[PDB]
Design a protein around this ligand. Structure first.
Ligand SMILES: CC(C)(C)NC(=O)[C@@H]1C[C@@H]2CCCC[C@@H]2CN1C[C@@H](O)[C@H](Cc1ccccc1)NC(=O)[C@H](CC(N)=O)NC(=O)c1ccc2ccccc2n1
Length: 198
């Protein structure tokens, strides 16, 4: 199927004999599930996101069915607020991002122009908002806090900002603060007609 991004791209997964919902997340390198019961050996691991880091258990060679499509790969289990299917599994179900077409064997990076400046950013189906590293933008803004996998961060909220995403123009809300990576979230992805296809 093809999936637009006006709503979170949720799918049904089956893993460890159990059914769950998860988010198709082009911005995630790994697949991370809420605490659950899986069989077998695992290894401790630390992973980062917005907000900081979390400890998870790493299971390798796990069979997972994603909306009926089977994949075997690494699944991390720990204190995430949302089940996320990252690029490690997305590639196995032939997921593509279209807006050109983009495969997910590498991070889906694009060039953006905003506030007169060129930057690189990550096309992120798993992000509700667009969050940029600290930068100089003109105009008024409002304080705000947003959450990610490791907790929360304080950002400045700029509304009605013009941004060019790989040559495509959009106007919307941009958040600016201590993110390690520039991320383009669904609020802007819809405006450039981005779809997921698998
Ligand atoms: C999952 C993991 C493998 C660890 N990958 C990542 O976390 C990478 C890390 C990258 C480098 C650091 C900066 C962010 C990018 C993109 N992220 C993926 C990225 O898709 C990440 C996935 C996610 C979704 C929900 C909750 C937690 C995590 N999304 C986000 O961080 C965006 C940020 C935002 N507020 O718009 N968060 C959300 O969209 C969002 C939505 C609902 C929520 C409810 C409760 C708590 C937090 C919630 N966060």
């Amino acid at each position: 199927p093809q999936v637009t991004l006006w709503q979170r791209p949720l799918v049904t997964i089956k893993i460890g004999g159990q059914l769950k919902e998860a988010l198709l997340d082009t911005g995630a390198d790994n697949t991370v599930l809420e605490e659950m019961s899986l069989p077998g050996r695992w290894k401790p691991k630390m992973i980062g996101g917005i907000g900081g880091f979390i400890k998870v258990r790493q299971y390798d060679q796990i069979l997972i069915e994603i909306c009926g499509h089977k994949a075997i790969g690494t699944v991390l289990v720990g204190p995430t607020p949302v089940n996320i299917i990252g690029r490690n599994l997305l590639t196995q179900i032939g997921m593509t991002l279209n807006f050109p077409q983009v495969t997910l064997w590498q991070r889906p990076l694009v060039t953006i122009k905003i506030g007169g400046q060129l930057k690189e950013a990550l096309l992120d189906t798993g992000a509700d908002n667009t969050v940029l590293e600290e930068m100089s933008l003109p105009g008024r803004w409002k304080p705000k806090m947003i959450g990610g996998i490791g907790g929360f961060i304080k950002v400045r909220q700029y509304d009605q900002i013009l941004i060019e995403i790989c040559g495509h123009k959009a106007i919307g809300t941009v958040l600016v603060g201590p993110t390690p990576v520039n991320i383009i979230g669904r609020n802007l992805l819809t405006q450039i007609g981005a779809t997921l296809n698998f």
